[PDB]
């Protein structure tokens, strides 16, 4: 059984747990940083979006970020930087008909799901300061132990 | 299979896949119509830790952050729609086959993305498809769109 739902909050997720993210229509889904070498934001882009510059507030900064979604699925744009002064790069995309995404702190790395349902897979970004990574979660969420990653992947891919 | 052709600069014909077969070229393809579409495919080898690399795209020197945690090759699809804009990392093809594609079709530029063997096609829109030309830095083949199923097979299984 999933642990949740939890309402949107700002907290320090424990190690070895998946945060399963369940947006409705929030532009910004998750902001995670340790304020030293990790800044990850997941943005949500609805279906049938023409290439356009959209405005997002990320870690209090006003950013204009080019997005497109030619599909009838939802896209999570994973935006990353490793330096406080840098611009965000569009690192990964999750293309989803479940509208579920993932975040986990494990093994000196921050993990997300990417690719296109139902073949979304995990990948990571490296950090020397995992313990200080804190998340503003803008959405309803659940917590799943890493031991149950297979169910977390089933949910992300099939709902 | 029509090829292999050598690296060249030319205007690909509408409704044909260019099937790109790098060895170790870091810039695989540069395509533009010099008005509303610039695409560059960059090749990032297996097991590259997060770093800044230098690429010359359309005569401009760029510093682009890249990373590849996997045992697959990654093609980073860099894109802009305006000559003054920086490139954005728009898509990635994560490949065991070291094959990528490009096609001018239906007022769009088409490429493959995702992870083999489930890579699929998506497009970027242009209002001037006919003027899109490509510098191709790799050996390549030419497959009609009528045989796109074979082109997807090659992308996904080699």
Residue numbers in the entry:
A (entry chain B): 1 to 159
B (entry chain A): 2 to 159
From the paper:
Each VP4 protein is cleaved by trypsin into two domains, VP5* and VP8*, corresponding to the stalk and the distal head of the spike protein, respectively. The RV VP8* domain adopts a classical galectin-like fold with the central structure being an anti-parallel β-sandwich formed by a five-stranded β-sheet and a six-stranded β-sheet.
The crystal structures of P (strain BM11596) and P (strain BM11596) in complex with LNFP I were solved. The VP8* of P BM11596 strain adopted a classical galectin-like fold as similar to other known VP8* structures, with two twisted antiparallel β-sheets consisting of strands A, L, C, D, G, H and M, B, I, J, K, respectively.
